[PDB]
PDB file of C-alpha atoms in Angstrom:
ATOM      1  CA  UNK A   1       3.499  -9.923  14.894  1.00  0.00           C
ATOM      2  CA  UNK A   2       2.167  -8.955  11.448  1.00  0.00           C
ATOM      3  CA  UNK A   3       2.821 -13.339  10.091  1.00  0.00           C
ATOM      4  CA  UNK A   4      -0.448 -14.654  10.982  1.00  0.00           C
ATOM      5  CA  UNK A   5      -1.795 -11.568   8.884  1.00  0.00           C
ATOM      6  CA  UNK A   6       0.417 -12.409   6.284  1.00  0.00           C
ATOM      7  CA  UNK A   7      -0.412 -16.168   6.047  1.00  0.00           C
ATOM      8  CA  UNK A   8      -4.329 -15.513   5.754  1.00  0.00           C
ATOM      9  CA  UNK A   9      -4.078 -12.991   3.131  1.00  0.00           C
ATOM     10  CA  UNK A  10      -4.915 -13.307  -0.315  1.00  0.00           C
ATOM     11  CA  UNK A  11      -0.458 -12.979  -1.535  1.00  0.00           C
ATOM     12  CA  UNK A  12       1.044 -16.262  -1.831  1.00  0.00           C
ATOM     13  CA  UNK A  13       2.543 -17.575   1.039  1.00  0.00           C
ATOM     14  CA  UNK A  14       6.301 -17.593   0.286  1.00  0.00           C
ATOM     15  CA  UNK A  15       9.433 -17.292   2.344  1.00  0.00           C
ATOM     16  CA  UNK A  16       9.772 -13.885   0.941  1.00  0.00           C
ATOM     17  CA  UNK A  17       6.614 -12.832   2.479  1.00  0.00           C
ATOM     18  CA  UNK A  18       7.095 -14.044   5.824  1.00  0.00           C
ATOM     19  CA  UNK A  19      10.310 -12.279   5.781  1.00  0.00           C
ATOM     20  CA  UNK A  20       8.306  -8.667   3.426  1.00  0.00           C
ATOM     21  CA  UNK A  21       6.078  -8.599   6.809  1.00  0.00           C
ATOM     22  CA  UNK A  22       8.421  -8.787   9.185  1.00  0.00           C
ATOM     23  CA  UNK A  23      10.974  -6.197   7.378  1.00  0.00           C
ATOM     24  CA  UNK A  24       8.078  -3.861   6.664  1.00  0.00           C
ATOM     25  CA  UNK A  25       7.008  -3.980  10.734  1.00  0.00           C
ATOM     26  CA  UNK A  26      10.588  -3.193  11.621  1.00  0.00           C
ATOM     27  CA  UNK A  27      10.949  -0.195   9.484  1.00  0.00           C
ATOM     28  CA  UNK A  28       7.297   1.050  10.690  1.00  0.00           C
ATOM     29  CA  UNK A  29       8.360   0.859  14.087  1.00  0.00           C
ATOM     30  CA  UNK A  30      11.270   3.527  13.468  1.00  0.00           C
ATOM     31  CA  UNK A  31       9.608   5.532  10.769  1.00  0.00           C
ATOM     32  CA  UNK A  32       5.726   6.379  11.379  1.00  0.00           C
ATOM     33  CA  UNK A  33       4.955   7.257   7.598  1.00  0.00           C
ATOM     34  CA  UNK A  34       6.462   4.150   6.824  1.00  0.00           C
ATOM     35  CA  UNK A  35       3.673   3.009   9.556  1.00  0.00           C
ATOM     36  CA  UNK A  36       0.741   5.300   7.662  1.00  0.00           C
ATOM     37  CA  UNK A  37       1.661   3.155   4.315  1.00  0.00           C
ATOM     38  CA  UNK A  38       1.617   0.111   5.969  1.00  0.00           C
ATOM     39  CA  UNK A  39      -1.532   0.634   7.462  1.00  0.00           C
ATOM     40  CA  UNK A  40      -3.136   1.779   3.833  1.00  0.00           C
ATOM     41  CA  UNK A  41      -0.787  -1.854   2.635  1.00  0.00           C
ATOM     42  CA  UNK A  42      -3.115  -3.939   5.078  1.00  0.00           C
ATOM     43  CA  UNK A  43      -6.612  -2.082   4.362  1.00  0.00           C
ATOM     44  CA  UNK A  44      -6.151  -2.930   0.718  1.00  0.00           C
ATOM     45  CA  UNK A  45      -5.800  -6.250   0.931  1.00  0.00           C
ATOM     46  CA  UNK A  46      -8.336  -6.505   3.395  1.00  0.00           C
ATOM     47  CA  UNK A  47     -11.006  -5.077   1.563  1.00  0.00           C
ATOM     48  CA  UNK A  48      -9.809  -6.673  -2.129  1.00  0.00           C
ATOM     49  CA  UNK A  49      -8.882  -3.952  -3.642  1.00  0.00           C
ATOM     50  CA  UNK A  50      -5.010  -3.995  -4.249  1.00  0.00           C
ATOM     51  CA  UNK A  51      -5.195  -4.890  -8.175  1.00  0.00           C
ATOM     52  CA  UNK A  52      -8.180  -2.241  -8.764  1.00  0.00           C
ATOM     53  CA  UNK A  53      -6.014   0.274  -6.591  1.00  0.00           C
ATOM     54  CA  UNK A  54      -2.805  -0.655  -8.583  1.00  0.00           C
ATOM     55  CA  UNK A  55      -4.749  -0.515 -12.446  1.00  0.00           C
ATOM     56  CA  UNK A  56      -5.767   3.059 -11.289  1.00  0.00           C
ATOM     57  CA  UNK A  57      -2.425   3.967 -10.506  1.00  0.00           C
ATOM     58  CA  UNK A  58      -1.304   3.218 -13.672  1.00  0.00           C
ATOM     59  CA  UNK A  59      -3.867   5.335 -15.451  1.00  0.00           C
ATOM     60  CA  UNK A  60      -3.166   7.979 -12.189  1.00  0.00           C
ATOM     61  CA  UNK A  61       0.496   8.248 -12.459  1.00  0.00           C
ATOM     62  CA  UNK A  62       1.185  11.581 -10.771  1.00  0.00           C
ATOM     63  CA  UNK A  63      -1.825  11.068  -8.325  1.00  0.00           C
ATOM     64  CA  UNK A  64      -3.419  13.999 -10.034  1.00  0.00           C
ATOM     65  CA  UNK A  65      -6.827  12.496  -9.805  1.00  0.00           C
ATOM     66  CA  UNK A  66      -6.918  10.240  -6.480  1.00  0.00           C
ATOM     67  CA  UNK A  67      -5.295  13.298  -4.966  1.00  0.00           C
ATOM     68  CA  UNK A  68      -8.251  15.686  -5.962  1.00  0.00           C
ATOM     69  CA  UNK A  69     -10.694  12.992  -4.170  1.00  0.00           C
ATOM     70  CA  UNK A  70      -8.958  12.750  -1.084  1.00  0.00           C
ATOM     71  CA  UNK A  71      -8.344  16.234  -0.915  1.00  0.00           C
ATOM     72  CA  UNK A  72     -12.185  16.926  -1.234  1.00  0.00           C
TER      73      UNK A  72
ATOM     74  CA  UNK B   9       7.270  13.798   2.529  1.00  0.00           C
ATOM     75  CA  UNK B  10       9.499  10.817   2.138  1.00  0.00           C
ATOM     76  CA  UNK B  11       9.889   7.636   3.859  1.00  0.00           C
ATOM     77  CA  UNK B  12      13.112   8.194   6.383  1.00  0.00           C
ATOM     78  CA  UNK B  13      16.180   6.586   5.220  1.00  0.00           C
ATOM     79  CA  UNK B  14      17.112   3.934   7.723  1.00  0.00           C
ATOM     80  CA  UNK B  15      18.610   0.459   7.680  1.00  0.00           C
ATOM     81  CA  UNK B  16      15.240  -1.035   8.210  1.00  0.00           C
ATOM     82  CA  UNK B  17      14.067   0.878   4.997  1.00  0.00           C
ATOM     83  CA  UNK B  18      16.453  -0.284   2.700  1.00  0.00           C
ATOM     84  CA  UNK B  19      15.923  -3.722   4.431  1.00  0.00           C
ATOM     85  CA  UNK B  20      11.597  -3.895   4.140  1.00  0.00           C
ATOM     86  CA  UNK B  21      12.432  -2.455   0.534  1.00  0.00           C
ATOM     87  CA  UNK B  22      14.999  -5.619  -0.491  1.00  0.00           C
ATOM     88  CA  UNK B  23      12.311  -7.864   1.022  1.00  0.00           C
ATOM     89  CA  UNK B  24       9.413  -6.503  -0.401  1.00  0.00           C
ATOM     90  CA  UNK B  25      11.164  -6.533  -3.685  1.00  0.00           C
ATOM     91  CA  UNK B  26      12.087 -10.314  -3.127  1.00  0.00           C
ATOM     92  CA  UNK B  27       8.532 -10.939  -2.236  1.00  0.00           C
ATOM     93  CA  UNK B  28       7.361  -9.277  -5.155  1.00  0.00           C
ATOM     94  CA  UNK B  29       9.657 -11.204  -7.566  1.00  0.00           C
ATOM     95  CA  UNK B  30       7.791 -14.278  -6.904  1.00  0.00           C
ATOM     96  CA  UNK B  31       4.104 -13.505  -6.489  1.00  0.00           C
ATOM     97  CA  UNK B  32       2.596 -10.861  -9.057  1.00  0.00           C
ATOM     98  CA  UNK B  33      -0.141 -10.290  -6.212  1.00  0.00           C
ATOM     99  CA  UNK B  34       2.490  -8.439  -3.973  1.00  0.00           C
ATOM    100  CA  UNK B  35       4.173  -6.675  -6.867  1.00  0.00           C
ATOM    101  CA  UNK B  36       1.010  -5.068  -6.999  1.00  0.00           C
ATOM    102  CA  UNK B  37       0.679  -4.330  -3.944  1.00  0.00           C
ATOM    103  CA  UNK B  38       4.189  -3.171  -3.785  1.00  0.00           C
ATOM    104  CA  UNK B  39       3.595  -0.666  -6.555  1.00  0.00           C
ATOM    105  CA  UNK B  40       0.600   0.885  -4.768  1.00  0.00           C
ATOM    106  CA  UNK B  41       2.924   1.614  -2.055  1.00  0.00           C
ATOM    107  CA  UNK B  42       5.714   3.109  -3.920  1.00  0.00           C
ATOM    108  CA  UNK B  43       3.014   4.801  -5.810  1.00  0.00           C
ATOM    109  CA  UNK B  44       1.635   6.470  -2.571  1.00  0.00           C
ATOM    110  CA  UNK B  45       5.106   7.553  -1.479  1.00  0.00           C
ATOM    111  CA  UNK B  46       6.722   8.977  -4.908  1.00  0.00           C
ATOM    112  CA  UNK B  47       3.357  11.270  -4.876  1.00  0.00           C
ATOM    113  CA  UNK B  48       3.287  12.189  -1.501  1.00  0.00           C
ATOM    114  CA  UNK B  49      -0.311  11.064  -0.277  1.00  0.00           C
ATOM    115  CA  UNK B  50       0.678   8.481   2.235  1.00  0.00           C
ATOM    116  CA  UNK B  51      -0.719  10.229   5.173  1.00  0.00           C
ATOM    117  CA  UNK B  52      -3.367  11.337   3.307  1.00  0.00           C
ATOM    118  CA  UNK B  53      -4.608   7.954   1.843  1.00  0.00           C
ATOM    119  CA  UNK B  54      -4.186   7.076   5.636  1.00  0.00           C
ATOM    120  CA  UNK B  55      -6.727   9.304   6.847  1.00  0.00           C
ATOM    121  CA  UNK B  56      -8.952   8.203   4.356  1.00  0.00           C
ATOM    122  CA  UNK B  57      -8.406   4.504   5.140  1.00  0.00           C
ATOM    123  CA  UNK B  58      -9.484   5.840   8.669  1.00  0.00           C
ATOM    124  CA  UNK B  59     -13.048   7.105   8.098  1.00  0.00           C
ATOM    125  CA  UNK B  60     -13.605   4.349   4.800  1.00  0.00           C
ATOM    126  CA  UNK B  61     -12.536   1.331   7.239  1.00  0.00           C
ATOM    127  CA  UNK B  62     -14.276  -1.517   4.745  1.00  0.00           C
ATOM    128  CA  UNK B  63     -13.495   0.660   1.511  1.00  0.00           C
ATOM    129  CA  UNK B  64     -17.022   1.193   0.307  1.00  0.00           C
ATOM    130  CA  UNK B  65     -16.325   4.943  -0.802  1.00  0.00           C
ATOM    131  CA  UNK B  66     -13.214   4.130  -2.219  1.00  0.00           C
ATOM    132  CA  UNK B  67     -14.695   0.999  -3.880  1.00  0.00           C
ATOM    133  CA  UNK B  68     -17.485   3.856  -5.691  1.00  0.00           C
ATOM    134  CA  UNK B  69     -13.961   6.016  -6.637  1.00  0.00           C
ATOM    135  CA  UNK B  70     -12.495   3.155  -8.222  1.00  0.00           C
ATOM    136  CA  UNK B  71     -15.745   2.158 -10.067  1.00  0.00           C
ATOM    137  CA  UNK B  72     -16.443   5.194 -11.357  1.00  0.00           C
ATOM    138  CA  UNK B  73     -12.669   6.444 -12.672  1.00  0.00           C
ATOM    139  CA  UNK B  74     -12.412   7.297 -16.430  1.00  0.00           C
ATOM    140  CA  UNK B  75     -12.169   4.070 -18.542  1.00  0.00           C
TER     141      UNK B  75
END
């Protein structure tokens, strides 16, 4: 289902993340918030912005910040 | 909330780990995600992903966070 996605993306193509894809459909499929992050997975690599996301997370740890933005 | 604590969990967790072991790109990734859940803004960054479908306002969030 979610393997032609993962071959066009920008994460090497690997085994592993044929298999990541597949694993990651399964468990949204029997838990929905496991869905809701899967969906917010896809959207960042689809718009570019998983590195930038991930550096602010670092400086972000406890979501303090991002948080306040969404929240608002 | 908390991701539900099912076989297929610990399963998509394993692989995602696996995955992330060999390409720095989905370790990222992979972070973000853990990152979301640990804090507890999963649905919320959903609903956001919702209404910003091609990131633009999140783009201007990132951009502009404290060096």
């Amino acid at each position: 289902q979610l393997v032609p996605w993962a071959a066009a993306s920008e994460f090497k193509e690997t085994p592993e993340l044929e298999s990541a894809v597949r694993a990651m459909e399964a468990a949204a499929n029997v838990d929905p918030l496991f869905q809701s992050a899967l969906s917010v997975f896809m959207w960042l690599e689809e718009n570019g912005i998983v590195t930038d996301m991930a550096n602010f997370a670092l400086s972000d740890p406890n979501a303090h910040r991002m948080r306040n933005f969404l929240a608002n």
